[PDB]
Structure 1
Amino acid sequence: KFFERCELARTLKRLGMDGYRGISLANWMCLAKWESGYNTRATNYNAGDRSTDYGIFQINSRYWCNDGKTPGAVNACHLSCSALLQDNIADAVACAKRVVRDPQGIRAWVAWRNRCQNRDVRQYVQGCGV
């Protein structure tokens, strides 16, 4: 499913993302926007290392979820990567939270550094009631 902006903002807020480990909701929105355009079914195969990015946050199969076809991969969120392809983003949010508990925090995603870090992200939550 492709979420509408504010619909996603409140969906994320209800899931406990607002300020999670110091990360504002607008930051998560910016992340999902640039990672998948708010598309829960987004997938990107990385032919270079044989891994695949799954869902709204484009979480990688090498370390976070298990798809059974990524060489020497681990599964830190302890989830089938299929769980990251659901319209319901609860499992994807649980995994995104797992990612940010690591030292890098939100910096785990290169796209966040490229398109959200030190950017005016207010636009993502304006008028959403969050």
Structure 2
Amino acid sequence: KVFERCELARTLKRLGMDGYRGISLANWMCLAKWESGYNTRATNYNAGDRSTDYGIFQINSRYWCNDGKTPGAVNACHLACSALLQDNIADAVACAKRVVRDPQGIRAWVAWRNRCQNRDVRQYVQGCGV
């Protein structure tokens, strides 16, 4: 499923993402936009370390989910990576929360640092009623 901007904003808010560990909803919106373009079935294979990124937040199989084919990987979210390709993003949201519970917080994703850190993210939630 590909979310429409405001649809996703409200979806994320109802899931308790606004201000989770100090990260505004707008930041989450900017992350999803640059990671998958709001596409829940987006995947990206990394040939170098044989891992893959899954879903709207492009979460990596080396540490966060299990896809059974990433050498020496762990599964911190205790989820099959398939759970990260569902149209319903509740599981992806629980895992994204787990990801930012680590040291880096939202900086865990390089894309956020490149397109959201220090830039304008308020534009992502404007007019969405959140």
Question: TM-score if structure 1 supplies the norm length?
Answer: 1.00
Aligned partners of 2:14, 2:94: CA distance in 1, in Å?
12
Give the secondary-structure state (helix, strand or coil) at the position aligned to 2:52: strand
The aligned residue for residue 28 of structure 1 is: 28
Describe the superposition over 1:23-66 as per-residue Cα deviations: whole angstroms up to 9, x where unpaired: 00000000000000000000000001100000000000000000
Aligned partners of 1:121, 1:23: CA distance in 2, in Å?
12
Aligned partners of 1:119, 1:24: CA distance in 2, in Å?
13
Aligned partners of 1:98, 1:114: CA distance in 2, in Å?
22
The aligned residue for residue 18 of structure 1 is: 18
Describe the superposition over 1:55-113 as per-residue Cα deviations: whole angstroms up to 9, x where unpaired: 00000000000000000000000000000000000000000000000010000000000
Give structure 1 regions of 4+ aligned residues with deviation exceeding 2 angstroms: none
Deviation of 1:121 (Å): 0.7
Aligned partners of 2:103, 2:86: CA distance in 1, in Å?
28
Give the secondary-structure state (helix, strand or coil) at the position aligned to 2:16: coil
What is the root-mean-square deviation in Å for CA atoms of aligned residues? 0.3
Question: TM-score if structure 2 supplies the norm length?
Answer: 1.00
Deviation of 1:8 (Å): 0.0
The equivalences for 1:1-130 within 5 A come to 1-130=1-130
Aligned partners of 1:102, 1:60: CA distance in 2, in Å?
14
Structure 1 residue runs without a partner (length 5+)? none
Give me the identity figure in percent: 98
Structure 2 residue runs without a partner (length 5+)? none
Aligned partners of 1:78, 1:16: CA distance in 2, in Å?
20
